[PDB]
Amino acid sequence: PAARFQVQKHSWDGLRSIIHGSRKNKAPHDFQFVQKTDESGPHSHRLYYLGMPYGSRENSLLYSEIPKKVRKEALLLLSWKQMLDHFQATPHHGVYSREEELLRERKRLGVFGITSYDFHSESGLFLFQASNSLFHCRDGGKNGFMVSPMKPLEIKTQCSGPRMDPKICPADPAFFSFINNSDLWVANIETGEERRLTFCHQGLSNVLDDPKSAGVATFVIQEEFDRFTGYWWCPTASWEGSEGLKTLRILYEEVDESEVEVIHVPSPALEERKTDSYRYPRTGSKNPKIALKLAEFQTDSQGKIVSTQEKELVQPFSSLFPKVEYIARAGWTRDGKYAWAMFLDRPQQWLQLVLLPPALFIPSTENEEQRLASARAVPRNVQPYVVYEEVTNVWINVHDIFYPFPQSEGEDELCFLRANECKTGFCHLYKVTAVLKSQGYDWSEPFSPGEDEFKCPIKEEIALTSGEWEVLARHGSKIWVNEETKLVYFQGTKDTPLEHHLYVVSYEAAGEIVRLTTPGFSHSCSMSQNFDMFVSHYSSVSTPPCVHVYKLSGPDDDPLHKQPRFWASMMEAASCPPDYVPPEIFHFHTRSDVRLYGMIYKPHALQPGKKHPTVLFVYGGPQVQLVNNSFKGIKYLRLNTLASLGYAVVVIDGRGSCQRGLRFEGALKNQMGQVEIEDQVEGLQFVAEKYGFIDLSRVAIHGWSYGGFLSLMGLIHKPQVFKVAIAGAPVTVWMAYDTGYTERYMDVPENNQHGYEAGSVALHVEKLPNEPNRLLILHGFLDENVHFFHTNFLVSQLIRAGKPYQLQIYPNERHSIRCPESGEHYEVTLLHFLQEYLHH
């Protein structure tokens, strides 16, 4: 038969040398296209973005000039121009305030420097956080275009502590907003006047007695709903009152975390031996009490803030919308006529999109007579409108795509584009027309509306897309709508679940879908609001990422068939290193006839007739797809390093993984751990049969977070398949994880005792090996996501069951290893564990 390949044994310092030698940049992102309006000049656009070029040590604000003409037989590489002159945005040592540090963790930001900016195109104002403060600069508009970097200007404050989530006022760019000490503020950038708008935070010495915030996304909203803001500027000014003062409006979420459980997580300054306190809603326990409110302020001709007002719903949020647990998203119609919100129930099986006219909000007051007078003055024809409802027996994934069209005068309907997955089980674009008919309400007379009370008739609902593929509507994916040509641009998996592509379809006469991106790569695209050009950041399994600029070209009478003409490069693909070998993608059909995709890192310098020790690298949880046609060598270089030593590395996207529709991910509903391990084992056995170089007697299972959970599930349920498990930051008891994630997939513990018990690996330690050196646990001590508690509880159970274990801690790490020295130590530790204990 086949010989068994033996990986070379190295000393510990030899393994350090291999890892250090193996490790012998952020592409342009967050694009703004600005048209240049001068016929004589050679540039059509300035393109603004964030990037870290090769010579730089941080992410900063950059621009490139897009030429009117390019040579056909020559590749233009655009110069990256610095907006900021010798400006360090990173604070000392890359040590952020706790507020900025935790936001960077929630957003998975690793790069130092400016990681976001707000831009007002008409004025050319840029507003961003830098150096523990707020800075601005101006380019374009009336001031003209810079040709060398400028010093940004610090915005002075009398506020104590961080100014978070800064945004420019759309209607009047003299104003911006920020959060300070859990309240919403505004300031005039020109005069330096600041004004507090909300008064939720009392500033009590005992923070636990001070549980309200305004304008803030709480922990579960940031970690599990991908929402990082709790306030939304009205895009328009209004002129109520006889004095002729200008009113500016902000919709905001007020939260009360009083009933939310408090946990303590060690702080990164280890020598201080202290914790930070978190309102951490564990599954089955209380989420924050929430409401939408309206903050208003008035300004005079000189830009002086004359007055401020908190307004609340004329009847309480909890009375109007009694089954709402979460606000997923909110915003405004472009005319400011309606605020809107996306509401979820606690089971996350029911979503409503609701219009809220500003007239439904009345001034907050302690005076009962004034409050009742305000309520009585709300016009009878003012109400919430539920313009869309999504219901499922699986779960609602929050999709970010909701595009309301402008209404005509006297028109009692709203037309909108909506991404909807629950209708067919695949996320698709629909054009929806809702009828807005006033029932007539006496808002001074309290009532208990049911769920259907404010429901709008649907006049029309047109599928713009259909089939067994997805429109991408999550984690930064969006649509772009050209109302002149009646085209919607979107990203999707129509060509293959392995590649993201840009497409265009008519929303007027839904028919042909045109693909605008190059097949054989996975694309991340940014479209000009003038629909004249777009950027694609793309890669393949074999080819490092590039960033290319395309001009949409051809007859204006045929907009659907505009050519994406390659125009210029912002970044050419790095050379594939000679010691990097891309993984190979495969697919197979399970015994139940489900198609699964996988990847295999073949042992380097592979010889026929030899079976190699194998690492099954697993994530396996919802909302992630590990296997796709994109470059893996930046994020997963360590898997190439394993293959270079003679390990085979296998990755399987089993049922529960994403980009395959709701029914595919729905397989794990209420039974997390169970179908995932069956698919991992079927995949491993398929790879062994097809490729013939897998030694099934020497398989390690390794993953982080959900992957750490499945590594332990593998050793517990399939101890004859998996010789060793290496479990990083594992979930070991689902009852210790949060509401937003755990309840979506598993229900509350009281409703799914069997599934919680079967899925909690710390309750099955009696099934873990009674042999030493089969189990290595790794965990960041500062982890605020999968708490170090999960590992501590697992260890407590291992001691009680009389089981051996190996443990490594990363004292200075949260949920991921960010420090290069700790990353190398982790990789050396893994190589050592495999060389000693995966071998017989």
Residues 576, 582, 587, CA angle at the centre, nearest 5°? 150
Spot the catalytic one: 428, 501, 702, 815: 815
Which among 40-48, 230-238, 261-269, 334-342 is the span making contact with its own copies, rule CB under 8 A? 261-269
Q: Coil, helix or strand for 286? A: coil
**206: which residues sit within 8 A by CB, 6+ positions away?**
none
Q: For residue 478, report the phi and psi dihedrals to the nearest 5 degrees.
A: -145, 175
Q: How far is CA 24 from CA 147, 398, 474, 539, 820, in A?
A: 36, 41, 35, 22, 12
Shorter beta-carbon distance to Na ion: residue 266 or 656? 656
What residues form DSSP beta bridges with 610?
3
Cα separation of 584 and 643, whole Å? 12
- Residue 71's CB: how many other CB atoms inside 10 A? 8
Q: Is 593 a catalytic residue?
A: no
Choose which of 38, 39, 73, 271 interacts with its own copies (CB under 8 A).
Answer: 271
Q: Is 566 exposed, middle or buried (0-12, 13-18, 19+ CB in 10 A)?
A: middle
Cα separation of 608 and 618, whole Å? 27
Which among 425-433, 564-572, 716-724, 804-812 is the span making contact with its own copies, rule CB under 8 A? 804-812
Q: How far is CA 72 from CA 69, 77, 302, 517, 549, in A?
A: 9, 13, 53, 19, 14
- Cβ at position 428, least distance to Na ion in Å: 12
The answer to the question of residue 750 lying near its own copies (CB under 8 A) is no
Shorter beta-carbon distance to its own copies: residue 806 or 816? 806
Choose which of 86, 273, 591, 635 interacts with its own copies (CB under 8 A).
Answer: 273
Which among 9-17, 186-194, 391-399, 404-412 is the span making contact with its own copies, rule CB under 8 A? 9-17
Cα separation of 566 and 574, whole Å? 19
Per-residue mark of binding to its own copies, 274-303 (x: CB under 8 A): xx----x-----------------------
Residues 201-220 that bind its own copies (CB under 8 A): 204-206, 208-209
Which among 67-75, 333-341, 379-387, 789-797 is the span making contact with its own copies, rule CB under 8 A? 789-797
Judge whether 492 and 469 are in contact, CB under 8 Å: yes
What residues form DSSP beta bridges with 333?
none
Handedness of CA 749, 752, 754, 755 (dihedral sign): negative
Cα separation of 348 and 346, whole Å? 5
Shorter beta-carbon distance to Na ion: residue 658 or 727? 658
Shorter beta-carbon distance to its own copies: residue 608 or 802? 802
Amino acid identity of residue 521, one-letter, is F
Residues 681-740 that bind its own copies (CB under 8 A): 736
Shorter beta-carbon distance to its own copies: residue 642 or 798? 798
Per-residue mark of binding to Na ion, 612-651 (x: CB under 5 A): ----------------------------------------
Would the annotation count 79 as a binding residue?
A: no
Residues near Cl ion (CB under 5 A): 102, 696, 718, 720, 770, 820, 823
Spot the catalytic one: 177, 477, 522, 705: 705
Residues 100-129 that bind Na ion (CB under 5 A): none
Cα separation of 840 and 696, whole Å? 12
The answer to the question of residue 95 lying near its own copies (CB under 8 A) is no
- Cβ at position 266, least distance to its own copies in Å: 8
- DSSP secondary-structure letter at 661? -
Shorter beta-carbon distance to its own copies: residue 154 or 836? 836
Q: How far is CA 666 from CA 374, 492, 730, in A?
A: 48, 20, 22
The answer to the question of residue 16 lying near its own copies (CB under 8 A) is yes
Which among 190-198, 332-340, 648-656, 818-826 is the span making contact with its own copies, rule CB under 8 A? 818-826
Judge whether 460 and 432 are in contact, CB under 8 Å: yes
Give the one entry of Cl ion, Na ion, its own copies, none that residue 26 binds, where binding means its C-beta sits below a cut-off of 5 to 8 angstroms depending on kind: none
Give the one entry of Cl ion, Na ion, its own copies, none that residue 718 binds, where binding means its C-beta sits below a cut-off of 5 to 8 angstroms depending on kind: Cl ion
The answer to the question of residue 579 lying near its own copies (CB under 8 A) is no
Cα separation of 324 and 747, whole Å? 16
The answer to the question of residue 1 lying near its own copies (CB under 8 A) is no
End-to-end CA, the chain: 18
Choose which of 264, 334, 475, 561 interacts with its own copies (CB under 8 A).
Answer: 264
The two tokens of residue 523 are 């694309």
Q: Report which residue's Cβ sits closest to Na ion.
A: 658
Residues 119-138 that bind its own copies (CB under 8 A): none
The answer to the question of residue 795 lying near its own copies (CB under 8 A) is yes
Give the one entry of Cl ion, its own copies, Na ion, none that residue 808 binds, where binding means its C-beta sits below a cut-off of 5 to 8 angstroms depending on kind: its own copies
Task: Provide the edge-to-edge strand list for the sheet that holds 501-506.
Answer: 480-482, 487-492, 501-506, 514-515
Choose which of 787, 815, 834, 838 interacts with its own copies (CB under 8 A).
Answer: 787
Q: Is 705 a catalytic residue?
A: yes
Choose which of 191, 370, 530, 796 interacts with its own copies (CB under 8 A).
Answer: 796
Amino acid identity of residue 523, one-letter, is H
The two tokens of residue 383 are 């109400």
Choose which of 592, 809, 839, 840 interacts with its own copies (CB under 8 A).
Answer: 809
Spot the catalytic one: 165, 540, 783, 790: 783
Shorter beta-carbon distance to its own copies: residue 153 or 270? 270
- 210-214 contacts, C-beta under 8 A, 24 or more apart: 210/182, 211/256, 211/257, 211/258, 211/260, 211/279, 212/182, 212/254, 212/255, 212/256, 212/257, 213/182, 213/183, 213/254, 213/255, 213/257, 214/182, 214/183, 214/184, 214/252, 214/253, 214/254, 214/293, 214/295
- Cβ at position 665, least distance to Na ion in Å: 5
Q: Is 374 a catalytic residue?
A: no
Give the one entry of Na ion, its own copies, Cl ion, none that residue 771 binds, where binding means its C-beta sits below a cut-off of 5 to 8 angstroms depending on kind: its own copies
Give the one entry of Na ion, Cl ion, its own copies, none that residue 802 binds, where binding means its C-beta sits below a cut-off of 5 to 8 angstroms depending on kind: its own copies
Cα separation of 472 and 624, whole Å? 13
Cα separation of 138 and 130, whole Å? 16
Choose which of 579, 772, 839, 840 interacts with its own copies (CB under 8 A).
Answer: 772
Amino acid identity of residue 614, one-letter, is T
Q: Report which residue's Cβ sits closest to Cl ion.
A: 823
**169: which residues sit within 8 A by CB, 6+ positions away?**
175, 176, 177, 186, 233, 248
Give the one entry of Na ion, Cl ion, its own copies, none that residue 806 binds, where binding means its C-beta sits below a cut-off of 5 to 8 angstroms depending on kind: its own copies
Give the one entry of Na ion, Cl ion, its own copies, none that residue 720 binds, where binding means its C-beta sits below a cut-off of 5 to 8 angstroms depending on kind: Cl ion
Q: 114-148: buried (b, 16+ CB within 10 Å) or exposed (e) per residue?
A: bbbbbbbeebbbbbbbbeeebbbbbbbeeeebbee
Give the one entry of its own copies, Cl ion, Na ion, none that residue 809 binds, where binding means its C-beta sits below a cut-off of 5 to 8 angstroms depending on kind: its own copies
The answer to the question of residue 85 lying near its own copies (CB under 8 A) is no
Residues 649-668 that bind Na ion (CB under 5 A): 658
- Cβ at position 593, least distance to its own copies in Å: 43
Cα separation of 492 and 467, whole Å? 11
Q: How far is CA 225 from the centre of its chain?
A: 8
- In terms of residues, how long is the chain? 840
Give the one entry of its own copies, Cl ion, Na ion, none that residue 40 binds, where binding means its C-beta sits below a cut-off of 5 to 8 angstroms depending on kind: none
Shorter beta-carbon distance to its own copies: residue 261 or 689? 261
Residues that bind Na ion (CB under 5 A): 658
Active-site residue list: 705, 783, 815
What residue numbers does the annotated binding site cover?
Answer: 705
Q: Which residues are annotated as a binding site for Val-boroPro?
A: 705
Rule CB under 8 A: which residues touch its own copies? Answer: 11-13, 16, 204-206, 208-209, 262-264, 266, 270-275, 280, 736, 770-772, 781, 787, 789, 792-793, 795-796, 799-800, 802, 804, 806-812, 821-822, 824-825, 828-829, 832, 836
